[PDB]
Amino acid sequence: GLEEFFDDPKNWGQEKVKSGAAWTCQQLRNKSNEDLHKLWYVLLKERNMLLTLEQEAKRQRLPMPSPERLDKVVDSMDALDKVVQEREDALRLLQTGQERARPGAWRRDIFGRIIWHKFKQWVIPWHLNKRYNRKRFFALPYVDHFLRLEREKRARIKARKENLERKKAKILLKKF
């Protein structure tokens, strides 16, 4: 029902709510999968309700009763997502020992910088796809000059930061 989009009408107009303590990681880890799914659904419903309340308050030109509950709900959702991701990673490592769920591999584009190419998933192989064939992967030699220039710029920035830290330490020592 649409009534779930708002809290108890008795609490409408109070500028104060008694609810906090976000779900930590250990508490989520110490729960089954169905209970975790139900908790995630309830937290999503609560987040929707709190977002609707925030929008209504912004439209009414009034402050928020307590966004701490929304922050804690977001933290609990993030913790649940992290726990689920860790469980999936452990299952994948114990099933095939493969790191990173999404497959991929390193490649060299035109710029030469070693970029972690991401797979797009296709239906036909790679030895006949017209579009993928155009996406070449090679930097050629002439880009070596630009690569050296970028490396020199990075080294200059690093040396500048080092001299900056050294001057800061010297000034601190001089002050005392």
Partner: protein, 97 residues
Amino acid sequence: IGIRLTLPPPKVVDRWNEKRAMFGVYDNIGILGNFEKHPKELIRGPIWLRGWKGNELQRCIRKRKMVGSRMFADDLHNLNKRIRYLYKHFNRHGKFR
């Protein structure tokens, strides 16, 4: 106005500093240290020069032929431009000739 107003704080200066109290020490080791190390090796500075006065153009050629093998691209280009300009201004422009 160019001149400021309030005076500056008292510029403290430690005349008996660790470097000042030891400035010039251990120098001249050759005339009495049975000649074991030249004073030119005591100064701590650039690697391409360490005991050779020279001149601007000469110092530039030295830095090029001694560090140019590991210098940056822009730095090497600027050094070459400076050397060429100094040569064109010395071996042609000037006075008394």
